[PDB]
Amino acid sequence: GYVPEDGLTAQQLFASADGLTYNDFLILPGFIDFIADEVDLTSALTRKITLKTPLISSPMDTVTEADMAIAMALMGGIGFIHHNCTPEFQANEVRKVKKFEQGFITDPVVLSPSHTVGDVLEAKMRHGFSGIPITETGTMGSKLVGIVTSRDIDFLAEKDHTTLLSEVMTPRIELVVAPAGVTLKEANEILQRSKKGKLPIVNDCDELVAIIARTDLKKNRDYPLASKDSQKQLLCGAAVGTREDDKYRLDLLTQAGVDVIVLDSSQGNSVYQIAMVHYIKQKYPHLQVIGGNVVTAAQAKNLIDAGVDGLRVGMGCGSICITQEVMACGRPQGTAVYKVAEYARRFGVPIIADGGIQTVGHVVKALALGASTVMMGSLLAATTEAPGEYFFSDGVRLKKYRGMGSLDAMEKSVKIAQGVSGSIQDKGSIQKFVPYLIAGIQHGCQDIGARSLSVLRSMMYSGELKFEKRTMSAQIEGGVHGLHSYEKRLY
Amino acid sequence: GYVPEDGLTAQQLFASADGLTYNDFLILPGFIDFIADEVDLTSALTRKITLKTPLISSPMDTVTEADMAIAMALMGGIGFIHHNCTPEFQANEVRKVKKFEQGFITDPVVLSPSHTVGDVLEAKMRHGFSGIPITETGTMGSKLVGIVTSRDIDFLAEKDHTTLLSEVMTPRIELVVAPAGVTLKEANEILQRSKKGKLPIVNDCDELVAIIARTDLKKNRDYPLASKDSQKQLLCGAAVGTREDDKYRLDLLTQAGVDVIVLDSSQGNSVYQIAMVHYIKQKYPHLQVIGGNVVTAAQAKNLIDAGVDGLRVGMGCGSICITQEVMACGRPQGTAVYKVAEYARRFGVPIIADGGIQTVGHVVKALALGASTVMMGSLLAATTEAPGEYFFSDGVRLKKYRGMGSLDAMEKSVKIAQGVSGSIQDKGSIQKFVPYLIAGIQHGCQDIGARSLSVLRSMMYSGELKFEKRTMSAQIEGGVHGLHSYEKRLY
Amino acid sequence: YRLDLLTQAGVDVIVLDSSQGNSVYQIAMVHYIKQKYPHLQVIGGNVVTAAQAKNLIDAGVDGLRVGMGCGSICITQEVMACGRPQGTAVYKVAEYARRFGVPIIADGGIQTVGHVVKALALGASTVMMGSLLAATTEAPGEYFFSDGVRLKKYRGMGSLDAMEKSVKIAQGVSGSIQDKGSIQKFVPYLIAGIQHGCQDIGARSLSVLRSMMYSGELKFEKRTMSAQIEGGVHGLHSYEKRLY
Ligand SMILES: Nc1nc2c(ncn2[C@@H]2O[C@H](COP(=O)(O)OP(=O)(O)OP(=O)(O)O)[C@@H](O)[C@H]2O)c(=O)[nH]1
Ligand SMILES: Nc1nc2c(ncn2[C@@H]2O[C@H](COP(=O)(O)OP(=O)(O)OP(=O)(O)O)[C@@H](O)[C@H]2O)c(=O)[nH]1
Ligand SMILES: Nc1nc2c(ncn2[C@@H]2O[C@H](COP(=O)(O)OP(=O)(O)OP(=O)(O)O)[C@@H](O)[C@H]2O)c(=O)[nH]1
Ligand SMILES: Nc1nc2c(ncn2[C@@H]2O[C@H](COP(=O)(O)OP(=O)(O)OP(=O)(O)O)[C@@H](O)[C@H]2O)c(=O)[nH]1
Ligand SMILES: Nc1ncnc2c1ncn2[C@@H]1O[C@H](COP(=O)(O)OP(=O)(O)OP(=O)(O)O)[C@@H](O)[C@H]1O
Ligand SMILES: Nc1ncnc2c1ncn2[C@@H]1O[C@H](COP(=O)(O)OP(=O)(O)OP(=O)(O)O)[C@@H](O)[C@H]1O
Ligand SMILES: O=c1[nH]cnc2c1ncn2[C@@H]1O[C@H](COP(=O)(O)O)[C@@H](O)[C@H]1O
Ligand SMILES: O=c1[nH]cnc2c1ncn2[C@@H]1O[C@H](COP(=O)(O)O)[C@@H](O)[C@H]1O
Ligand SMILES: O=c1[nH]cnc2c1ncn2[C@@H]1O[C@H](COP(=O)(O)O)[C@@H](O)[C@H]1O
């Protein structure tokens, strides 16, 4: 009949202990009754935002600009766009993420019939797309007079300069349309049946109110996980500081349509951060705030009291970071995640485990310890979507990976540095790499016997999930060992 | 007035000498009267094939399958598909290169109205495209009854299994068509004006004779340099051996539509190779033959007498090669290229400089010494289009790079190994990397004062082009030296 | 426009910065300067042959910069096949340019004060240093550490990181150099080294050194690679290279 109890509960693992890292422990295997592919990875980012994937790209200038944030959101994670740039640059990166996928396009590029083929080529150069509805004024609210696309300007070579759009358009008599007040699903069925690539939406006065594009329905079927708002735009996060000038940056990011703000700090338990959370929650009540760089429940209390919608957890972990060796201050990250999540769950506040995520097994550990999402810096650095360009050193394709408190960065791009300006080897695309992390998380949960990240956390808090501590020699034994050379071909 | 003569002519450089490599000499700078961008790189591959770029991907299993050959041809070079594979696999790689861009598609995928949406999706799965004309037989020469594309099957969810194409097609009453005997230029005008993505070509009996696709006109404007045959398909090369069973491989490659054959040997001056050249030139008189890895004029004579249309130059150079330390036999590559090209030019036979090309300066040297084209192995290995998958070893993104006499290749992938089965760090895409090599060749020619590769070779043979020989310490001084670390960020 | 700003800021000499100065573009710029600013000294100059030097001396340059593809940071030879071994270039161009009274600057590949004495002996009137003065205190930018070593950046002006306004081909490689201290101590060390080189040679000045070289009084010996080993630091376990 009976079998004895084996391993520690999480409450036991952190009680009789020094601060553990992810490397200091294993999760004991459970019972498998399900397929890894059926493991649900649905994740709370904040009180009101849910992601289909637990994964976040960190707000760093060598990790997250618009290409990373688009790719993360398409993979069912999110990106937070970094703030080591002008307020206007950051708002433009946010605008790029929000424009990439659209339901109703309500603020399209529009031209007059008095504009020219060269104005459509300049529009395509400046905004990326050729499909431009034509209205009497060349402003959105006028009577629809036609539609111009790349197939209409295709191979009209050097006629750019003075060819008026009127003779180039598909004229309004010829175009398929939907009435205003059509639902997105009804407009999609009209567009799908029409076999056209645009469907203009016009009111009873025959003037343009929105347009929809077939490329968004293609993006729909291409990206089943994608993190979208109610109007089917990709979710975007952005960082801001807690200085007075961050109020201007915050206003630019909110009119760019940012969904969630992260307050970027080494040590978020401050009068400056509590003041910024209160300022945001009064001025932009719709806006989700991750106020958050904490490692203790005492810090978490003050930000949850200030009204944060999520917390970022970690201090002095993080591959690029030297905060612990400069300020003495921080915590071992597994202990921090467990302590802060066990407290913050009482208030319904989700936890982001930030920094020190070197492997997909560290992601599964962070999630098992009570994180609702995991934020990666270096693990996503030197992907193709990460900012900047590759170079070669001793014989190796490398990309920069900076740290936002490195004294390269800061400098308006005595000053105390908290980071160290690294290099990282090439990883390829986020659109292949994040599906690998997803499958790794799913197989980790499967070996543990958890059908979802929600049941994984419930097994952890009930004490059904068992842990074993590792000696240093268990960390050697659990790594690659005894070989001459090896080829770590992940995915 | 007068200025004294400075440096050696090529004839002097190779006369009073040991065998020189590309590293052993420099070209002296000339006069610049032109922009590097106006340097013409037009190159003879063989007696009848001219490329817009001097660049060739080598027939190796870690370098050239169809993705590399497509990318090389699009960049105005060519790829030779390797032969360390079944005859049927190699011919299917050649078929993929020949199908990627089309003028008239005269052998399209066709279906019957009695086929289904599921048959169109399965056709798209096999061949990569959804644009399928419908004929009442579902075979090419028959009455056109409609056209089906991805916009016709788009967002039909699970209706695949039994929905007949008849009710899915654009019917023949609605479709824009051109008459048979229309020129490609005339069909392109009809297609461009129609704003459609296909244009079927039909005879007076209203049965399908060809089709054309707008995506080929897009590929036209996207790829100005592309190496195309008369019917606008990409040029493809293939390797073959000189064994009796290579006659079967050659028949498969010729019906797959290969444009040029390279006879793959370490030492091409053999009765076996001369017999294979004679066999090809009698059985396939249209087919271009590059014979001969040769390094002497005496070897070149026998293959030019056999009737080769081009020669490969190199023996025992090549990053992967160990022929010299296994057979004692070969030549320093700069000397070999100069000697063989100075002989072969008398017969109008172009030279491929093959192997030992580590840098774009080595390309400019090979071209200056009389090569009409340059073939690269390792320089194109670990591009994205190179066969196989990336791995990590020393914290470095690597791809395998094998060699064809290596002992891992000769297992159908006493045997004597002539190569060494190694690895190369990631390079990114051919479609970015070959424009960098092109621009580097152009700036090399510009510093030399040559407006084209044709005038560069004429300056070399007349003695206008001057060379200086390098000590080992000049090779140190000419490299990166005296630094602690460096970042070789090419392009 | 840049030239007009530099001339009203009071610049004394302009250097025309190119990999390969024997061009219609450079000869046109030399003519433009010599008519618009007749007071202004022009070093039009990145040459390695007498044929290149002729066209710039005919254009009216007041000095030539000599060197191509030498230079610690440089990859021009391995990107363009084009250049010359620097000792040969300096001697060839100086033996020609002295006929016209045009001084030569030997530029790049100067690693040691002995290379300065060789460049001056071979007919250079001045020597230009990049990397030998990089990571002095007066060199632009800030020190960092990597391998437990105090380093300053040293870029190359055809680095793709110098380009991008700090297809676009690179001619240089974005390196690092170890700290050297101040120019105001380091250049007096180079001066003393040049003076002792001249003294061991028996030359009382750089003018007599060049005259001894052109008359054939100054004698040279070629070195095998093993002479370049024997003439270096060799056969020790470790050493401290404490210059000055
Ligand atoms: N035009 C447009 N329609 C969309 C977009 N996203 C979803 N839709 C429409 O809304 C429908 C609902 O899609 P769902 O799959 O249920 O959920 P979703 O999160 O909206 O879309 P997925 O990203 O595919 O999961 C789709 O079938 C489309 O008809 C979009 O970006 N643009
Ligand atoms: N056309 C258009 N697309 C927009 C606009 N704003 C965002 N988008 C998005 O950009 C994408 C447009 O894709 P396509 O419809 O393929 O672009 P296109 O209009 O065909 O233009 P080309 O790709 O240049 O031929 C969709 O995902 C749109 O939602 C806008 O103003 N106009
Ligand atoms: N359908 C089709 N038409 C083509 C193709 N290649 C060229 N054409 C047509 O032939 C014309 C001539 O093109 P050119 O630019 O003169 O020379 P090319 O070598 O054929 O094409 P490029 O590859 O662009 O240089 C183009 O404008 C097209 O109308 C192709 O692959 N398919
Ligand atoms: N459709 C079609 N294209 C072919 C065929 N053989 C080669 N091709 C080439 O494949 C490309 C087809 O491109 P598209 O016209 O964009 O493909 P599509 O038919 O629209 O199908 P989807 O891309 O799946 O929607 C062109 O470059 C064609 O020349 C064939 O049998 N049918
Ligand atoms: N709603 C519409 N009704 C009628 N015609 C339209 C409509 N939308 C676009 N068109 C016209 O249809 C043609 C194709 O445009 P469409 O948006 O469908 O594809 P496209 O994006 O331009 O094609 P492609 O992807 O091949 O580049 C053009 O002539 C365009 O003006
Ligand atoms: N020659 C033609 N005449 C009339 N209709 C056509 C013709 N060729 C294609 N069609 C129809 O036009 C619609 C669009 O097909 P088309 O080839 O032009 O674009 P597509 O490649 O399918 O579009 P997309 O690139 O957006 O996926 C489909 O309904 C198709 O059946
Ligand atoms: O300069 C810095 N000093 C301290 N912490 C930093 C700095 N820059 C970024 N971080 C943190 O490091 C995390 C990324 O760590 P990583 O995933 O281990 O590489 C970020 O999300 C930040 O929390
Ligand atoms: O195994 C081998 N032994 C000898 N030569 C080889 C072998 N495999 C390929 N080569 C040659 O090496 C050339 C590529 O050299 P690379 O460009 O320097 O890497 C090829 O095009 C062949 O001529
Ligand atoms: O990017 C570059 N490519 C080529 N030559 C350069 C570049 N940048 C500087 N140089 C040359 O290198 C010289 C300095 O060489 P160094 O003293 O050996 O370090 C400079 O004075 C220039 O002539």
Coordinates of N, CA and C and ligand atoms in Angstrom, one line a residue, chain A residues 57-60 63 264-266 293 312 314 316-323 354-358 375-380 401-406 417-420, ligand 7:
Chain A
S57 N 10.4 39.8 -22.7 CA 11.8 40.4 -23.0 C 12.0 41.6 -22.2
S58 N 13.2 41.7 -21.6 CA 13.6 42.7 -20.6 C 13.7 44.1 -21.3
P59 N 13.3 45.2 -20.7 CA 13.5 46.5 -21.2 C 15.0 47.0 -21.1
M60 N 15.8 46.5 -22.0 CA 17.2 46.8 -22.2 C 17.5 47.2 -23.6
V63 N 18.3 44.5 -25.9 CA 17.2 43.4 -25.9 C 16.0 43.8 -26.6
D264 N 11.3 51.3 -13.9 CA 12.6 50.7 -14.0 C 13.6 51.2 -12.9
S265 N 14.0 50.4 -12.0 CA 14.8 50.7 -10.9 C 15.6 49.5 -10.4
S266 N 16.8 49.7 -9.8 CA 17.5 48.6 -9.1 C 16.7 48.2 -7.8
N293 N 11.1 46.6 -8.6 CA 12.3 45.8 -8.5 C 12.6 45.5 -7.1
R312 N 8.0 43.2 -10.5 CA 9.2 42.6 -11.0 C 10.1 42.3 -9.8
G314 N 13.8 40.6 -8.5 CA 15.2 40.3 -8.7 C 16.0 41.5 -8.3
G316 N 20.4 42.1 -8.3 CA 21.8 41.7 -8.3 C 22.1 40.3 -8.9
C317 N 21.1 39.5 -9.1 CA 21.1 38.5 -10.1 C 20.9 39.2 -11.5
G318 N 21.1 38.5 -12.6 CA 21.1 39.1 -13.9 C 22.5 39.1 -14.5
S319 N 22.7 38.5 -15.6 CA 24.0 38.2 -16.2 C 25.0 39.4 -16.2
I320 N 24.5 40.5 -16.6 CA 25.2 41.8 -16.9 C 25.4 42.7 -15.6
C321 N 24.8 42.3 -14.5 CA 24.6 43.1 -13.3 C 25.8 43.0 -12.3
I322 N 26.2 44.1 -11.7 CA 27.2 44.2 -10.6 C 26.6 45.0 -9.4
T323 N 25.3 45.2 -9.3 CA 24.7 45.9 -8.1 C 25.1 45.3 -6.8
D354 N 12.8 38.2 -12.8 CA 13.6 39.0 -13.7 C 15.1 38.7 -13.4
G355 N 15.9 38.2 -14.4 CA 17.3 38.1 -14.4 C 17.8 36.8 -13.8
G356 N 19.0 36.3 -14.3 CA 19.6 35.0 -13.9 C 18.9 33.8 -14.6
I357 N 18.1 34.0 -15.6 CA 17.5 32.9 -16.4 C 18.5 32.5 -17.6
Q358 N 19.3 31.5 -17.4 CA 20.3 31.1 -18.3 C 19.8 30.0 -19.2
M375 N 11.1 37.1 -17.0 CA 11.7 38.1 -17.9 C 13.1 37.7 -18.2
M376 N 13.5 37.7 -19.5 CA 14.8 37.4 -19.9 C 15.5 38.6 -20.6
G377 N 16.8 38.8 -20.2 CA 17.7 39.7 -20.8 C 18.6 38.9 -21.7
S378 N 19.7 38.4 -21.2 CA 20.8 37.7 -22.0 C 20.3 36.5 -22.8
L379 N 19.3 35.8 -22.3 CA 18.8 34.6 -23.1 C 18.2 35.0 -24.4
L380 N 17.7 36.3 -24.6 CA 17.2 36.8 -25.8 C 18.1 37.8 -26.5
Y401 N 25.7 43.2 -25.6 CA 24.7 43.0 -24.5 C 25.1 43.9 -23.3
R402 N 24.4 45.0 -23.1 CA 25.0 46.2 -22.4 C 24.8 46.3 -20.9
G403 N 23.6 46.1 -20.4 CA 23.3 46.5 -19.0 C 23.0 48.0 -18.9
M404 N 21.8 48.3 -18.5 CA 21.2 49.7 -18.5 C 21.9 50.7 -17.6
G405 N 22.5 50.1 -16.5 CA 23.4 50.8 -15.6 C 24.9 50.6 -16.0
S406 N 25.2 50.0 -17.1 CA 26.6 50.2 -17.6 C 26.9 51.7 -17.9
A417 N 28.5 52.9 -12.0 CA 28.0 51.8 -12.9 C 27.4 50.7 -12.1
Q418 N 26.3 50.1 -12.5 CA 25.7 48.9 -12.0 C 25.8 47.7 -13.1
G419 N 26.3 47.9 -14.3 CA 26.4 46.9 -15.3 C 27.7 47.0 -16.1
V420 N 28.0 46.0 -17.0 CA 29.3 45.8 -17.5 C 29.6 45.5 -19.0
Ligands
LIG7 O1 23.2 47.6 -15.5 C1 22.4 46.9 -14.9 N1 22.6 46.7 -13.5 C2 21.8 46.0 -12.7 N2 20.8 45.3 -13.2 C3 20.5 45.4 -14.6 C4 21.2 46.2 -15.4 N3 20.7 46.2 -16.7 C5 19.7 45.3 -16.6 N4 19.6 44.8 -15.3 C6 18.7 43.7 -14.9 O2 19.1 42.5 -15.5 C7 18.0 41.8 -16.0 C8 18.4 40.8 -17.1 O3 19.2 39.8 -16.6 P1 19.6 38.5 -17.5 O4 18.4 37.9 -18.1 O5 20.2 37.5 -16.6 O6 20.6 38.8 -18.5 C9 17.1 43.0 -16.4 O7 15.8 42.7 -16.8 C10 17.3 44.0 -15.3 O8 16.5 43.6 -14.1

